[PDB]
Design a protein around this ligand. Structure first.
Ligand code: ADP
Length: 518
């Protein structure tokens, strides 16, 4: 039986379609969502979910969370380096990637790829489903933010593979929410705007939905904007206030910083229904206490630039779809951070007073849609009609002379899709031709994101310009690129090497074996 898993920055959620309805499956503590946390105790036990989150403040250096903020990224990504300040666990460079180092007991250190931490969370979600169903689960539909790039998508698929899941399909979070909203609606064509603000990533998608046919027309997002940033703004405010008032810098005391996290998260949630919240920490730093009152006004002020920046993707989507505000028929809010009154206010005011769709739990709707998609793809006949057209989030291009982004596949193209181009050599007997592929909307490649460097190898000896090598760039239904090459000369095997350094089957097998030790 195939399940849907929403693998989220702060929480994850698992659903199954069975007997004609979605069940959101409760974990072994009775909770319909599970924290995306993993911890290693001094005694050598591994904890996942609620139990891991519960001991953050007593064992901060060996409690891992927010792995989705690191997954599929390089070490020098500014989103990685900015986030290190607020994470209690050591982040070390390895394979040009941010790895996570922890103590597993007896002095002993272990280093993990972000994929391996996310695999442990997926395994706990799988086990939650297996307990409910009373049998093994080997197949799943797993979520990603719509604006996740090629590397982030592949790394999430690899986490699935490490967790013993055949990932049937990667689904974009707002698309999943749209399915939850729109399955079995027979209203004819409606324009639906999904505003998806979770713990770590932000997406906006505009879909048409018409009697079981769903199409993403335009999407735009920010993969490093979410609830964790709102917390960290408030945390930094108090870390600096403490140093100003006392002289003492607490940024290296991990217990101090993560006790502040715990209190800030609590206060933030309270401030969605109250106007003031009390922050209290006993033995915050060097045996001293910390008490501060946080008003809703101050919380809003500390985050207002980030809140107002959520309108940037909304306008980008309206521009790309050539629609006006008045053409939007329904606004669907998902992600837990859409509970923030100021966020609701900003969206409502942007659409001239339009109220959001009712009956949608912003914590669960993404998993609900993923579970529907799993059931449909399995061959269920008691599911609602579902035909889905989804898109690539980023323009792919190739670097040409002058550091120029030459466009190959535009953003918002329905996937799967492909494009071919003929390449040749610049020098006599040249054996290798290198192609650099970028992701982004800027005219120069230095302002876009490098996807990969691909080498066409084994070009047979000939005079410059004579070889004719057709290279095909295909984005599959998961949004992941595959590059292949064929010799179109008159009367050779052309192999492509790349610098992406994906996890190999050998490496994955080692990671599966290492996870079995706990
Ligand atoms: N009532 C609330 N007020 C403010 N923020 C909330 C509220 N409920 C949940 N959140 C935030 O939403 C995020 C949780 O989003 P959710 O969709 O449940 O999981 P994920 O963050 O993994 O997407 C967290 O950052 C959390 O602080």
């Amino acid at each position: 039986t195939v399940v849907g898993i929403d693998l989220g920055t702060t929480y994850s959620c698992v659903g199954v379609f069975k007997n004609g309805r979605v069940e959101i499956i409760a974990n072994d503590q009775g909770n319909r969502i599970t924290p995306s946390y993993v911890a290693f105790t001094p005694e050598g036990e591994r904890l996942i979910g609620d139990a891991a989150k519960n001991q953050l403040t007593s064992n901060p250096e060996n409690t891992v969370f927010d792995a989705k903020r690191l997954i599929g990224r390089t070490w020098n990504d500014p989103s990685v380096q900015q986030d290190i300040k607020f994470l209690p666990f050591k982040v070390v460079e390895k394979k040009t990637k941010p790895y996570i180092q922890v103590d597993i007991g007896g002095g002993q250190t272990k280093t993990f790829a972000p994929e391996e931490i996310s695999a442990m969370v997926l395994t706990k979600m799988k086990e939650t489903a297996e307990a409910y169903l009373g049998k093994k689960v080997t197949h799943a539909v797993v979520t990603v933010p719509a604006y996740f790039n090629d590397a982030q998508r592949q790394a999430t698929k690899d986490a699935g593979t490490i967790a013993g899941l055949n990932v049937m399909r990667i689904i974009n979070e707002p698309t999943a929410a749209a399915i939850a909203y729109g399955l079995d609606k027979r209203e004819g064509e409606k324009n639906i705007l999904v505003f998806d603000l979770g713990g770590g990533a932000f997406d906006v998608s505009l879909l048409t939905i018409d009697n079981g046919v769903f199409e993403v027309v335009a999407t735009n997002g920010d993969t490093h904007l979410g609830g964790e940033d709102f917390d960290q703004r408030v945390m930094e405010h108090f870390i600096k206030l403490y140093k100003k008032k006392t002289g003492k810098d607490v940024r290296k005391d991990n217990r101090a910083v993560q006790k502040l996290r715990r209190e800030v998260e609590k206060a933030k949630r309270a401030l969605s229904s109250q106007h003031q919240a009390r922050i209290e920490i006993e033995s915050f730093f060097e045996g001293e206490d910390f008490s501060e009152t946080l008003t809703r006004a101050k919380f809003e002020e500390l985050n207002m630039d980030l809140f107002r920046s959520t309108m940037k993707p909304v306008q980008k989507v309206l521009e790309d779809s050539d629609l006006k505000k008045s053409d939007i028929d329904e606004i669907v809010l998902v992600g837990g951070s859409t509970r923030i009154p100021k966020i609701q206010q900003l969206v409502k005011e942007f659409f001239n007073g339009k109220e959001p769709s009712r009956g949608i739990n912003p914590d669960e709707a993404v998993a609900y849609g993923a579970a529907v998609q799993a059931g449909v793809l399995s061959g269920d006949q008691d599911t609602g009609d579902l035909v889905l057209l989804d898109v690539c989030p980023l323009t792919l291009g190739i670097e040409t002379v002058g550091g120029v982004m030459t466009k190959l596949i535009p953003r918002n193209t329905v996937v799967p899709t492909k494009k071919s181009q003929i390449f040749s050599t610049a020098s006599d007997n040249q054996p290798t031709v290198t192609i650099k592929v970028y992701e982004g909307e800027r005219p120069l490649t230095k302002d876009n994101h490098l996807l990969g460097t691909f080498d066409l190898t084994g070009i047979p000896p000939a005079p410059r310009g004579v070889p004719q090598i057709e290279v095909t760039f295909e984005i599959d239904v998961n949004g992941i690129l595959r590059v292949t090459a064929e010799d179109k000369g008159t009367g050779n095997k052309i192999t492509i090497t790349n610098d992406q350094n994906r996890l190999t089957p050998e490496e994955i097998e080692r990671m599966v074996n290492d996870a079995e030790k706990f």
